[PDB]
Amino acid sequence: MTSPFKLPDESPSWTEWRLHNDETNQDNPLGFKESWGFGKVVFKRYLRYDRTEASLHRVLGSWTGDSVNYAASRFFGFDQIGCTYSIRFRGVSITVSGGSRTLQHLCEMAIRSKQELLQLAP
Amino acid sequence: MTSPFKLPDESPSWTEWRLHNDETNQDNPLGFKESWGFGKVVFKRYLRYDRTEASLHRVLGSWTGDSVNYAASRFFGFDQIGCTYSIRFRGVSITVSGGSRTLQHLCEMAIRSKQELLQLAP
RNA sequence: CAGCAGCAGCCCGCCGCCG
RNA sequence: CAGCAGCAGCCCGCCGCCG
Incomplete structure (x- = not known):
């Protein structure tokens, strides 16, 4: 399966996640989750994000219109299929x-939603 | 039930909708649908929208943070409930x-999503 | 635009068990 | 953070019937 994503997943291990809970708070997680679905097939990423401009720029590069189209077009045909970004x-x-x-x-709309959510104030 | 909405619904009758189909096209509908859910109770509106600045300003007034909070707070208690804007x-x-x-x-995030979707290019 | 139904998927809230 | 399960809701795609 070719993924719509251009960065690898960064899910924390259970231990790393516990270490982070112990030392921080819902408003300061290690990162965010995002996913692309095309019919029944779903691709997911957890990506580290620390709210700096450098970090926002990096994680905005995790998929593009081209990379999503290339991955989705594997599943296309005559009938429309449902596509979803979360x-x-x-x-x-x-x-x-x-x-x-x-x-x-x-x-x-997905890229605008992503940028607006990741920049949402305190 | 007190609604989160400040404008009445504007669903077209079946006849008005057919008249509009006949004379227009998915990219030129009479308006848009939006809804607010708080636990199991859902409020919906269809609102006319013609893509002018006057019309965008009007339909952006259909609910506010205050009006949504007043309607949602009817359903609140100790446990969290799920809230959803669509x-x-x-x-x-x-x-x-x-x-x-x-x-x-x-x-x-809901008001930003609404403004960005309603202004989405051709 | 509205309503009922079937198939499939996603997302949210509550809640249990578990690495 | 991950996985399995229960309860409830929403949203999407396909599809039928219907005002």
Whole structure:
């Protein structure tokens, strides 16, 4: 399976996550989760994010309209399939979803949702 | 039930909707649908929207952080409940959801999602 | 636009068990 | 952070019937 993502997953081990809980707080997690679904197949990432501009720029590079289109187009055919982007950060989940015909518009709304959620104030 | 919405619903009748289909196209609907859910209770609106600045300003007034908090607080208690905003326009659905503890953050992301979707280019 | 139904998926809240 | 399970809701895609 070719993934829509350009960065590898960064899920913390159970021990790393416990170490982080012990030393921080829902509003200061190690990072965020995001996922892309195309019909029944779902790709997920956990990515480290520390709220600096450097870190925001890095994690905004985790998928592009091109990389999502390349991965999704594996699953395309005559009938439309459902496509969905989800992102969860600090207790708030955003999902952008529609049919594969509207995929470009879904990626534009998904990237804007991602940037707005990751920059949401204190 | 006190609604989170400050404008009445504007669902078209079946006949009005058919008249509009006949004379337009998924990218030029009469308006958009939006909904607020608080535990099991859901409030919905269809609102007319024609993509002008006047119209965008009007429909952005359909709920505020205050009006959503007043409606949601009817359903609050000790345990958190799930809160969800959804908006669908031109084939793309955005859902912002989380627990009632994060409701203010959900409203901030919901209003930004709404403005960004309603202004999405051709 | 509305309503009912089938198939499939995702997301949220509560809650248990578990690495 | 991961996995399995229960209860409830929402959203998406396909599809039928219907005002």
